[PDB]
Amino acid sequence: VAYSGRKIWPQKHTGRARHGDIGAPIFVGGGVVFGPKPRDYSYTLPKKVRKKGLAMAVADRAREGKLLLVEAFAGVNGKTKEFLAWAKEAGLDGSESVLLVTGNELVRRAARNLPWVVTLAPEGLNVYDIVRTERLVMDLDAWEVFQNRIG
Amino acid sequence: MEAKAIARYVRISPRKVRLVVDLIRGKSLEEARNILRYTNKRGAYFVAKVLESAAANAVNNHDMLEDRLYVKAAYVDEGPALKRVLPRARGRADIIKKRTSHITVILGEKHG
Amino acid sequence: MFAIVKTGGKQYRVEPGLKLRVEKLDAEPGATVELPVLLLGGEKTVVGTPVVEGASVVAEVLGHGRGKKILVSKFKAKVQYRRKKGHRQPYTELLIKEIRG
Amino acid sequence: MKTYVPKQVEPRWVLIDAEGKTLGRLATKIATLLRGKHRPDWTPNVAMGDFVVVVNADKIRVTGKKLEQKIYTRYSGYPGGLKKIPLEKMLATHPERVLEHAVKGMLPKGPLGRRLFKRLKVYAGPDHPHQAQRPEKLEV
Amino acid sequence: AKHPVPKKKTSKARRDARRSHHALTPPTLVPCPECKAMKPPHTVCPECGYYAGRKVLEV
Amino acid sequence: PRAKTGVVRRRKHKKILKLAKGYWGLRSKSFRKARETLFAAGNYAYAHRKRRKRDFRRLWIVRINAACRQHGLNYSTFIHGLKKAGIEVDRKNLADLAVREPQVFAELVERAKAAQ
RNA sequence: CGUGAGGGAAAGGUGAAAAGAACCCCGGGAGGGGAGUGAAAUAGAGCCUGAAACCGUGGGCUUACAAGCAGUCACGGCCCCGAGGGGUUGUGGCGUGCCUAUUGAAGCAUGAGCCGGCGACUCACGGUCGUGGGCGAGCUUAAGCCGUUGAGGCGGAGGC
RNA sequence: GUGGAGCCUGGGAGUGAGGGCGCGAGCGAUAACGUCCGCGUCCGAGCGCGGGAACAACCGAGACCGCCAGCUAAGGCCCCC
RNA sequence: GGAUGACCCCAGGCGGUAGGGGAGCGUUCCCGAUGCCGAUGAAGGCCGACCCGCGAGGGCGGCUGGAGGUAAGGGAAGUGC
Ligand SMILES: [Mg+2]
Ligand SMILES: [Mg+2]
Ligand SMILES: [Mg+2]
Ligand SMILES: [Mg+2]
Ligand SMILES: [Mg+2]
Ligand SMILES: [Mg+2]
Ligand SMILES: [Mg+2]
Ligand SMILES: [Mg+2]
Ligand SMILES: [Mg+2]
Ligand SMILES: [Mg+2]
Ligand SMILES: [Mg+2]
Ligand SMILES: [Mg+2]
Ligand SMILES: [Mg+2]
Ligand SMILES: [Mg+2]
Ligand SMILES: [Mg+2]
Ligand SMILES: [Mg+2]
Ligand SMILES: [Mg+2]
Ligand SMILES: [Mg+2]
Ligand SMILES: [Mg+2]
Ligand SMILES: [Mg+2]
Ligand SMILES: [Mg+2]
Ligand SMILES: [Mg+2]
Ligand SMILES: [Mg+2]
Ligand SMILES: [Mg+2]
Ligand SMILES: [Mg+2]
Ligand SMILES: [Mg+2]
Ligand SMILES: [Mg+2]
Ligand SMILES: [Mg+2]
Ligand SMILES: [Mg+2]
Ligand SMILES: [Mg+2]
Ligand SMILES: [Mg+2]
Ligand SMILES: [Mg+2]
Ligand SMILES: [Mg+2]
Ligand SMILES: [Mg+2]
Ligand SMILES: [Mg+2]
Ligand SMILES: [Mg+2]
Ligand SMILES: [Mg+2]
Ligand SMILES: [Mg+2]
Ligand SMILES: [Mg+2]
Ligand SMILES: [Mg+2]
Ligand SMILES: [Mg+2]
Ligand SMILES: [Mg+2]
Ligand SMILES: [Mg+2]
Ligand SMILES: [Mg+2]
Ligand SMILES: [Mg+2]
Ligand SMILES: [Mg+2]
Ligand SMILES: [Mg+2]
Ligand SMILES: [Mg+2]
Ligand SMILES: [Mg+2]
Ligand SMILES: [Mg+2]
Ligand SMILES: [Mg+2]
Ligand SMILES: [Mg+2]
Ligand SMILES: [Mg+2]
Ligand SMILES: [Mg+2]
Ligand SMILES: [Mg+2]
Ligand SMILES: [Mg+2]
Ligand SMILES: [Mg+2]
Ligand SMILES: [Mg+2]
Ligand SMILES: [Mg+2]
Ligand SMILES: [Mg+2]
Ligand SMILES: [Mg+2]
Ligand SMILES: [Mg+2]
Ligand SMILES: [Mg+2]
Ligand SMILES: [Mg+2]
Ligand SMILES: [Mg+2]
Ligand SMILES: [Mg+2]
Ligand SMILES: [Mg+2]
Ligand SMILES: [Mg+2]
Ligand SMILES: [Mg+2]
Ligand SMILES: [Mg+2]
Ligand SMILES: [Mg+2]
Ligand SMILES: [Mg+2]
Ligand SMILES: [Mg+2]
Ligand SMILES: [Mg+2]
Ligand SMILES: [Mg+2]
Ligand SMILES: [Mg+2]
Ligand SMILES: [Mg+2]
Ligand SMILES: [Mg+2]
Ligand SMILES: [Mg+2]
Ligand SMILES: [Mg+2]
Ligand SMILES: [Mg+2]
Ligand SMILES: [Mg+2]
Ligand SMILES: [Mg+2]
Ligand SMILES: [Mg+2]
Ligand SMILES: [Mg+2]
Ligand SMILES: [Mg+2]
Ligand SMILES: [Mg+2]
Ligand SMILES: [Mg+2]
Ligand SMILES: [Mg+2]
Ligand SMILES: [Mg+2]
Ligand SMILES: [Mg+2]
Ligand SMILES: [Mg+2]
Ligand SMILES: [Mg+2]
Ligand SMILES: [Mg+2]
Ligand SMILES: [Mg+2]
Ligand SMILES: [Mg+2]
Ligand SMILES: [Mg+2]
Ligand SMILES: [Mg+2]
Ligand SMILES: [Mg+2]
Ligand SMILES: [Mg+2]
Ligand SMILES: [Mg+2]
Ligand SMILES: [Mg+2]
Ligand SMILES: [Mg+2]
Ligand SMILES: [Mg+2]
Ligand SMILES: [Mg+2]
Ligand SMILES: [Mg+2]
Ligand SMILES: [Mg+2]
Ligand SMILES: [Mg+2]
Ligand SMILES: [Mg+2]
Ligand SMILES: [Mg+2]
Ligand SMILES: [Mg+2]
Ligand SMILES: [Mg+2]
Ligand SMILES: [Mg+2]
Ligand SMILES: [Mg+2]
Ligand SMILES: [Mg+2]
Ligand SMILES: [Mg+2]
Ligand SMILES: [Mg+2]
Ligand SMILES: [Mg+2]
Ligand SMILES: [Mg+2]
Ligand SMILES: [Mg+2]
Ligand SMILES: [Mg+2]
Ligand SMILES: [Mg+2]
Ligand SMILES: [Mg+2]
Ligand SMILES: [Mg+2]
Ligand SMILES: [Mg+2]
Ligand SMILES: [Mg+2]
Ligand SMILES: [Mg+2]
Ligand SMILES: [Mg+2]
Ligand SMILES: [Mg+2]
Ligand SMILES: [Mg+2]
Ligand SMILES: [Mg+2]
Ligand SMILES: [Mg+2]
Ligand SMILES: [Mg+2]
Ligand SMILES: [Mg+2]
Ligand SMILES: [Mg+2]
Ligand SMILES: [Mg+2]
Ligand SMILES: [Mg+2]
Ligand SMILES: [Mg+2]
Ligand SMILES: [Mg+2]
Ligand SMILES: [Mg+2]
Ligand SMILES: [Mg+2]
Ligand SMILES: [Mg+2]
Ligand SMILES: [Mg+2]
Ligand SMILES: [Mg+2]
Ligand SMILES: [Mg+2]
Ligand SMILES: [Mg+2]
Ligand SMILES: [Mg+2]
Ligand SMILES: [Mg+2]
Ligand SMILES: [Mg+2]
Ligand SMILES: [Mg+2]
Ligand SMILES: [Mg+2]
Ligand SMILES: [Mg+2]
Ligand SMILES: [Mg+2]
Ligand SMILES: [Mg+2]
Ligand SMILES: [Mg+2]
Ligand SMILES: [Mg+2]
Ligand SMILES: [Mg+2]
Ligand SMILES: [Mg+2]
Ligand SMILES: [Mg+2]
Ligand SMILES: [Mg+2]
Ligand SMILES: [Mg+2]
Ligand SMILES: [Mg+2]
Ligand SMILES: [Mg+2]
Ligand SMILES: [Mg+2]
Ligand SMILES: [Mg+2]
Ligand SMILES: [Mg+2]
Ligand SMILES: [Mg+2]
Ligand SMILES: [Mg+2]
Ligand SMILES: [Mg+2]
Ligand SMILES: [Mg+2]
Ligand SMILES: [Zn+2]
């Protein structure tokens, strides 16, 4: 703290309480005891857990019928209305949130702005996103990498 | 019907003026005027101004009649104090509070 | 005619038409119960020794409730011992129907 | 059922001939009468005892050597101010004080007990001025 | 001396009971018999300058 | 993140202050004095609901005793006679009888003399 | 503030918009009362909210024969809201503040005028036990690298 | 003898100023609200409750809460009570 | 008893300082949330003799306030004078 280290008034005979410097945490303006300092919250969760975790999450959507694999995306060539059309046709009215996983950049751009859609490349598939969303939609090429990652 | 006047931030200490204010609570406007007139306190100059101002308001804004007016309520509230240093022996500095009053007078009409 | 009846480890002087709160009875609201009689007085006087064989007081249970809360607080100086408990005693409300003498 | 509380009652006046009675053994009874504890509706926080008239207080009796040895005491607040007056002398000067003092000590301290004591009316000699009250004579 | 000092703060009840004798008594006033204006008895009237039935003073 | 006192302490103090309504001077006005006053108050209440049970029974007894002596016996005799007769009317009730119902009380007195 | 090196504060908020109150009235002025503005003016510039201590006016109940850690239990009176409750408190019963420190405190032992706000068991890294999971003769990666731009993966050196 | 008994492995303590009383001794003066040991107790932590006028350790007794019910304990029962 | 912490029934324990252990309440912040409550009135303040809870507390109503607040379930601490 910015104050000096001078003892503010003598130890004895002033009729006041003893103090040292006004930086001491007992003074308004003084330092703080045990406040937060810069911190690293990370830690290395076991790799197998992440793996087993990934797999279970996809498994969970699978068991609900909410996981849908697709071959390709019709006419979606980077326009929202294009993805929107395709989606309607694919059974995604947007009443249910969707984690769309595909390596097709053109498809991610088309869908990203939709409030009910989270997009990801397959290298990015992770359990928070699967668990946050109601429906899982994947490229086969996407489904392929995920199968290699849970191997 | 009521008419009121408030003198705010009068530089006199509440306890001193209340003493004068207490002399006129409930009195007829006329009696209160006499009393203040021959009350030997500084407070009387100030209470007299709030009275006369309330009386004016009664007659001029509120359609009440001077001859029927009486001090229906009056009170003194404390304003913010002026803090001043009073130097004492041995380096000590005391603090004098030069206190402040808000004086309220409220007149009513004593009907019939 | 009055009766001195005993319910809930306690005794009451009841007359027909009386509403009375007693300790909680295990009987549905609207039911009717027979209280024991220890003494009958009024026109004739009959004195239980301790209860009177034939008599009973008939009560309809109007309902069951909880008493207004009493705070039970405990404090011991110089020992930082403090306890605060809220207490509501359960009771039954009875209407006294008749004194079967 | 809550315990009965009496509404205000008309107090009963009573008359007692103190002659030849034993001071202390009379005083306890006067006390009971003043508290009102002969009454089945006794209530401890109201004056609802009898008014008590006593006559012939000067003819109260006392056992042992107490006329000579019983000493009444008064403190004035001043240095050396403890006066000691013996029974004999108190009887010879303010005889009614003897009973008065004994009954007073047998009443509760507090506002009520003080009030109860005012209901006691003690006279030396056979007569009293409470005729208007037509006090009922009591043997005790 | 050894610097006496209050042992306890005075309660509002006590402070104000000390002040049970502090009320001002209003000025005693009698009418001026000449101009009817209210004034202190035994003073020359400051409204009209009259005292003992005569003009004493320019007002 | 920081969690400053905020609203929390004013709210505990009002709770206590509100329980202290009625108390003298700072005892209803100062959180500190109120809290002291309340510690005492809760212990008395506890103690006193215990002794109310005693306070009343002592009263019933003074009353029963008065009513007995009108019929020429004392409380102690009357209670023994009741016991022997097998009468279990309690003192709360014996007392109400003694005042509201003199004829009934008389009969219980009778059974009591008779029972010995 | 200190000769000086040096110490070192407090102090934020009208309103959507100044529409920041023309004019009249009392007053030397300050201040107020009307008028006016505004959804709102106890938002009027000493301006959002506006707690508490503290000071006051008005009202209900109460108090001048009374003995007190200030309450509590009981009853009764009065006042209020409408077989009930609330306020108040006459009488009766009971009753030795809080905290600290002590063998032991109401203690004539410490601390505290009151109120509001600030105010003291944490974090890193290692260890030891317990515990929730993952894998199990095996378990695990570090620094880094790739990716992302709140996405994860790779990396077996090394450690147990 | 099934008890907030016991034994084993481990985690967390706190305590290491005691004090009164009864009995047994020493020290002291067959002194101390003295001191120092032993066995027991209570206070400590039961300054919660009844009795002892009042009163940590004497007598009675181990307070989970409520009751305007009953029986007792020590101590009491002439009035205060 | 029923099968499983659903609730009923019988019995027993439940004074406590140092101290061990358990279960909870509330404060700030994050996910929940591109959501939901909100000018037909956010937070905050002042009342309440009402409801729930052993309690810490939480509701509900009236007044003030005038623009924010934030659930079920979880997470993290500058968390309670
Ligand atoms: Mg510095
Ligand atoms: Mg520095
Ligand atoms: Mg500096
Ligand atoms: Mg330094
Ligand atoms: Mg320095
Ligand atoms: Mg230095
Ligand atoms: Mg010193
Ligand atoms: Mg000092
Ligand atoms: Mg100081
Ligand atoms: Mg100081
Ligand atoms: Mg110092
Ligand atoms: Mg310091
Ligand atoms: Mg220093
Ligand atoms: Mg410093
Ligand atoms: Mg700082
Ligand atoms: Mg700073
Ligand atoms: Mg600090
Ligand atoms: Mg620190
Ligand atoms: Mg520090
Ligand atoms: Mg830290
Ligand atoms: Mg860092
Ligand atoms: Mg950590
Ligand atoms: Mg790390
Ligand atoms: Mg989106
Ligand atoms: Mg979403
Ligand atoms: Mg004068
Ligand atoms: Mg005029
Ligand atoms: Mg000088
Ligand atoms: Mg000062
Ligand atoms: Mg000053
Ligand atoms: Mg019950
Ligand atoms: Mg009951
Ligand atoms: Mg204490
Ligand atoms: Mg104590
Ligand atoms: Mg303590
Ligand atoms: Mg202690
Ligand atoms: Mg304590
Ligand atoms: Mg008699
Ligand atoms: Mg009594
Ligand atoms: Mg004489
Ligand atoms: Mg006494
Ligand atoms: Mg000297
Ligand atoms: Mg001097
Ligand atoms: Mg000198
Ligand atoms: Mg001096
Ligand atoms: Mg002093
Ligand atoms: Mg004061
Ligand atoms: Mg006052
Ligand atoms: Mg005084
Ligand atoms: Mg004249
Ligand atoms: Mg913040
Ligand atoms: Mg804080
Ligand atoms: Mg704060
Ligand atoms: Mg607060
Ligand atoms: Mg608090
Ligand atoms: Mg608050
Ligand atoms: Mg609170
Ligand atoms: Mg009161
Ligand atoms: Mg007060
Ligand atoms: Mg006060
Ligand atoms: Mg106050
Ligand atoms: Mg409390
Ligand atoms: Mg109790
Ligand atoms: Mg008790
Ligand atoms: Mg007899
Ligand atoms: Mg018996
Ligand atoms: Mg019996
Ligand atoms: Mg210098
Ligand atoms: Mg300079
Ligand atoms: Mg310096
Ligand atoms: Mg500063
Ligand atoms: Mg602004
Ligand atoms: Mg602005
Ligand atoms: Mg606006
Ligand atoms: Mg002018
Ligand atoms: Mg002006
Ligand atoms: Mg004006
Ligand atoms: Mg104006
Ligand atoms: Mg308008
Ligand atoms: Mg509006
Ligand atoms: Mg307002
Ligand atoms: Mg405003
Ligand atoms: Mg201000
Ligand atoms: Mg604003
Ligand atoms: Mg404001
Ligand atoms: Mg203000
Ligand atoms: Mg205020
Ligand atoms: Mg008043
Ligand atoms: Mg007297
Ligand atoms: Mg009187
Ligand atoms: Mg009392
Ligand atoms: Mg009573
Ligand atoms: Mg009432
Ligand atoms: Mg009452
Ligand atoms: Mg005691
Ligand atoms: Mg005391
Ligand atoms: Mg004591
Ligand atoms: Mg405390
Ligand atoms: Mg301390
Ligand atoms: Mg010490
Ligand atoms: Mg010491
Ligand atoms: Mg010592
Ligand atoms: Mg003391
Ligand atoms: Mg003292
Ligand atoms: Mg000292
Ligand atoms: Mg002290
Ligand atoms: Mg010391
Ligand atoms: Mg100071
Ligand atoms: Mg204060
Ligand atoms: Mg504070
Ligand atoms: Mg720690
Ligand atoms: Mg560890
Ligand atoms: Mg582990
Ligand atoms: Mg694993
Ligand atoms: Mg190693
Ligand atoms: Mg076992
Ligand atoms: Mg054990
Ligand atoms: Mg054990
Ligand atoms: Mg531990
Ligand atoms: Mg240790
Ligand atoms: Mg230790
Ligand atoms: Mg040692
Ligand atoms: Mg040692
Ligand atoms: Mg020692
Ligand atoms: Mg020992
Ligand atoms: Mg020893
Ligand atoms: Mg002793
Ligand atoms: Mg020994
Ligand atoms: Mg012996
Ligand atoms: Mg020995
Ligand atoms: Mg030896
Ligand atoms: Mg000798
Ligand atoms: Mg010793
Ligand atoms: Mg000895
Ligand atoms: Mg010895
Ligand atoms: Mg021992
Ligand atoms: Mg200790
Ligand atoms: Mg004991
Ligand atoms: Mg023990
Ligand atoms: Mg205790
Ligand atoms: Mg004792
Ligand atoms: Mg005792
Ligand atoms: Mg005693
Ligand atoms: Mg004891
Ligand atoms: Mg027990
Ligand atoms: Mg018995
Ligand atoms: Mg015995
Ligand atoms: Mg005795
Ligand atoms: Mg006495
Ligand atoms: Mg316990
Ligand atoms: Mg446990
Ligand atoms: Mg725990
Ligand atoms: Mg909760
Ligand atoms: Mg909190
Ligand atoms: Mg929590
Ligand atoms: Mg944040
Ligand atoms: Mg968001
Ligand atoms: Mg939001
Ligand atoms: Mg809406
Ligand atoms: Mg609107
Ligand atoms: Mg509203
Ligand atoms: Mg909030
Ligand atoms: Mg907030
Ligand atoms: Mg609340
Ligand atoms: Mg609000
Ligand atoms: Mg906003
Ligand atoms: Mg939230
Ligand atoms: Mg939450
Ligand atoms: Mg979560
Ligand atoms: Mg802190
Ligand atoms: Zn004249």
Side-chain angles (χ1 to χ4, degrees), chain A, chain B residues 1-109 111-112, chain C residues 1-67 69-101, chain D, chain E, chain F:
Chain A
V1 97
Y3 310 108
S4 133
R6 200 193 67 185
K7 185 177 181 60
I8 49 164
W9 59 65
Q11 171 85 359
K12 307 176 72 70
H13 309 123
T14 73
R16 305 287 310 252
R18 342 122 165 173
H19 304 293
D21 60 286
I22 64 182
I26 198 176
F27 281 88
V28 172
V32 357
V33 175
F34 300 147
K37 307 295 285 196
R39 248 175 105 181
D40 187 354
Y41 287 87
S42 72
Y43 53 100
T44 299
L45 181 61
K47 283 174 162 166
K48 283 175 194 180
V49 177
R50 316 184 211 191
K51 211 171 65 200
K52 196 153 176 270
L54 226 213
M56 287 178 174
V58 170
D60 179 70
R61 287 290 172 272
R63 185 195 39 73
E64 282 169 321
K66 305 295 191 191
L67 159 60
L68 175 69
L69 262 24
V70 310
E71 234 150 23
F73 298 99
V76 339
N77 298 108
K79 289 294 278 177
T80 295
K81 49 85 193 178
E82 301 167 1
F83 176 82
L84 231 23
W86 174 94
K88 185 176 72 204
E89 192 66 26
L92 308 175
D93 54 24
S95 71
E96 272 178 295
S97 58
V98 173
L99 171 59
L100 183 65
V101 199
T102 160
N104 194 341
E105 279 197 357
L106 257 38
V107 183
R108 299 199 306 275
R109 316 196 325 200
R112 41 188 201 197
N113 218 46
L114 263 24
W116 46 279
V117 167
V118 180
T119 38
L120 274 188
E123 286 81 26
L125 189 63
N126 66 84
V127 352
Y128 178 60
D129 294 338
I130 301 166
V131 177
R132 293 160 61 197
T133 47
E134 281 166 311
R135 240 150 116 75
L136 222 198
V137 173
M138 279 196 254
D139 260 345
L140 284 170
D141 347 1
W143 179 253
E144 249 274 273
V145 0
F146 157 67
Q147 276 281 136
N148 297 327
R149 216 207 303 178
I150 68 169
Chain B
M1 192 63 197
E2 290 172 344
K4 87 179 182 151
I6 322 179
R8 301 173 77 231
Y9 306 105
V10 184
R11 235 310 284 154
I12 183 178
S13 173
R15 212 156 124 253
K16 296 166 178 187
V17 242
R18 275 194 267 255
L19 244 36
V20 173
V21 162
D22 294 349
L23 236 25
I24 66 170
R25 179 178 291 106
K27 269 33 178 50
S28 73
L29 169 61
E30 200 53 36
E31 195 174 353
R33 278 168 162 161
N34 289 319
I35 290 171
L36 297 185
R37 169 153 168 78
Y38 290 97
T39 289
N40 176 26
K41 304 281 200 177
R42 168 176 190 235
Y45 168 94
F46 296 113
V47 171
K49 292 181 106 99
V50 195
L51 188 56
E52 294 297 341
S53 175
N57 299 353
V59 158
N60 180 282
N61 306 311
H62 300 286
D63 200 52
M64 309 166 82
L65 291 171
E66 185 171 354
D67 325 40
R68 292 192 215 261
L69 294 171
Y70 81 111
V71 184
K72 186 180 177 188
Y75 48 79
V76 183
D77 290 316
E78 186 149 0
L82 292 170
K83 288 175 189 157
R84 295 299 189 260
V85 162
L86 164 72
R88 301 304 288 270
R90 308 202 69 106
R92 207 172 72 163
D94 281 350
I95 285 187
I96 271 179
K97 297 174 70 168
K98 284 180 171 176
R99 299 188 172 261
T100 251
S101 317
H102 298 321
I103 316 180
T104 294
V105 175
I106 298 175
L107 269 14
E109 265 175 320
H111 278 302
Chain C
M1 202 61 77
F2 70 83
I4 295 175
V5 304
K6 174 152 180 213
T7 174
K10 289 167 284 284
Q11 297 177 7
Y12 307 87
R13 165 168 169 144
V14 299
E15 307 198 0
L18 192 64
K19 295 181 202 82
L20 181 56
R21 289 199 224 270
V22 304
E23 299 291 336
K24 175 167 62 67
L25 301 162
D26 184 9
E28 226 79 345
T32 67
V33 300
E34 277 202 332
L35 273 7
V37 166
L38 298 182
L39 179 144
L40 289 171
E43 296 80 5
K44 58 143 158 170
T45 300
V46 30
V47 173
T49 280
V51 356
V52 351
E53 202 187 355
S56 84
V57 157
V58 172
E60 166 196 328
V61 2
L62 265 22
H64 300 302
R66 300 164 77 202
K69 183 184 282 172
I70 296 169
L71 297 197
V72 29
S73 123
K74 294 177 172 192
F75 170 90
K76 298 170 173 289
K78 300 198 177 71
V79 97
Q80 301 291 336
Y81 172 80
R82 294 102 106 121
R83 295 292 187 271
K84 167 176 192 160
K85 160 184 312 320
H87 184 97
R88 301 188 71 180
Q89 184 70 354
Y91 64 86
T92 289
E93 212 166 34
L94 297 179
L95 208 159
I96 297 308
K97 278 293 186 48
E98 43 157 337
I99 307 176
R100 309 239 255 243
Chain D
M1 39 145 345
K2 317 265 190 69
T3 287
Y4 172 75
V5 197
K7 294 267 149 35
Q8 195 145 328
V9 249
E10 266 275 14
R12 133 176 167 279
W13 289 59
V14 165
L15 182 150
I16 299 180
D17 190 344
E19 170 167 10
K21 291 180 174 293
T22 288
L23 171 63
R25 314 182 103 115
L26 179 51
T28 54
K29 315 198 185 88
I30 294 174
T32 300
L33 260 9
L34 265 1
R35 305 283 310 262
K37 276 161 77 191
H38 55 291
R39 300 184 52 119
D41 60 347
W42 179 76
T43 307
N45 69 328
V46 271
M48 40 113 261
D50 292 339
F51 278 76
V52 169
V53 188
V54 189
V55 290
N56 292 332
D58 44 318
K59 278 164 221 268
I60 202 78
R61 291 311 165 213
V62 107
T63 58
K65 286 209 263 309
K66 310 188 196 171
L67 251 22
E68 262 84 15
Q69 296 182 7
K70 184 191 173 75
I71 290 92
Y72 292 105
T73 253
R74 271 203 309 276
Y75 179 57
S76 66
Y78 284 75
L82 174 71
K83 268 201 171 74
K84 314 175 172 211
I85 312 164
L87 218 198
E88 277 173 353
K89 177 159 260 291
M90 185 69 71
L91 274 174
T93 53
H94 300 93
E96 65 282 343
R97 226 106 113 181
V98 175
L99 227 224
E100 268 180 1
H101 185 264
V103 171
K104 195 189 214 116
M106 301 188 192
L107 297 175
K109 314 283 188 221
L112 182 47
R114 271 182 237 125
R115 184 174 173 204
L116 292 193
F117 173 81
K118 295 169 201 176
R119 294 176 160 214
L120 161 71
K121 263 106 181 61
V122 171
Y123 298 90
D127 305 332
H128 68 82
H130 304 292
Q131 299 302 0
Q133 320 307 138
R134 294 152 105 221
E136 167 181 351
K137 173 109 186 312
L138 252 198
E139 310 300 309
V140 282
Chain E
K2 293 169 165 148
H3 199 142
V5 129
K7 183 61 135 188
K8 306 307 290 179
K9 178 174 173 174
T10 285
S11 72
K12 297 170 182 82
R14 215 170 303 219
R15 131 164 87 35
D16 286 343
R18 177 167 51 238
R19 305 169 165 185
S20 79
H21 307 274
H22 283 181
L24 312 178
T25 65
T28 109
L29 300 170
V30 297
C32 166
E34 275 70 72
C35 76
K36 313 300 180 213
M38 294 300 264
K39 82 175 195 61
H42 300 91
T43 62
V44 176
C45 179
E47 299 303 314
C48 76
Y50 275 75
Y51 186 83
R54 76 196 158 96
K55 182 78 171 164
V56 142
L57 170 144
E58 164 201 6
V59 78
Chain F
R2 173 172 184 253
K4 82 211 213 78
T5 303
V7 116
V8 162
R9 186 196 302 139
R10 174 177 54 237
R11 296 183 187 180
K12 289 197 144 39
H13 289 183
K14 296 189 93 75
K15 278 186 47 194
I16 287 300
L17 277 162
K18 188 191 175 185
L19 288 173
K21 271 176 173 323
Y23 300 172
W24 209 92
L26 294 217
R27 284 182 197 261
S28 47
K29 263 57 200 191
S30 141
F31 168 78
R32 281 155 55 126
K33 302 280 117 199
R35 173 183 240 161
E36 287 155 16
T37 303
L38 287 169
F39 288 149
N43 281 1
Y44 284 139
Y46 178 95
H48 291 172
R49 67 179 110 74
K50 287 300 172 88
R51 45 142 72 235
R52 175 174 60 214
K53 297 154 171 57
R54 311 171 211 172
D55 284 351
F56 276 91
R57 174 168 165 133
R58 252 142 111 302
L59 174 81
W60 296 332
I61 295 182
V62 177
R63 278 185 186 178
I64 280 156
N65 212 332
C68 288
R69 291 173 187 253
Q70 285 174 336
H71 297 106
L73 47 22
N74 60 21
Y75 174 98
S76 43
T77 306
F78 177 56
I79 297 279
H80 188 226
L82 257 24
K83 181 218 202 304
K84 272 157 75 49
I87 292 158
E88 286 165 34
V89 175
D90 70 20
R91 300 154 175 76
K92 182 180 67 179
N93 281 86
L94 261 3
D96 205 51
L97 288 172
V99 164
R100 306 191 112 98
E101 305 306 342
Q103 358 73 49
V104 173
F105 188 81
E107 157 76 348
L108 296 171
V109 167
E110 262 314 309
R111 305 245 177 157
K113 301 192 179 179
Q116 331 221 262

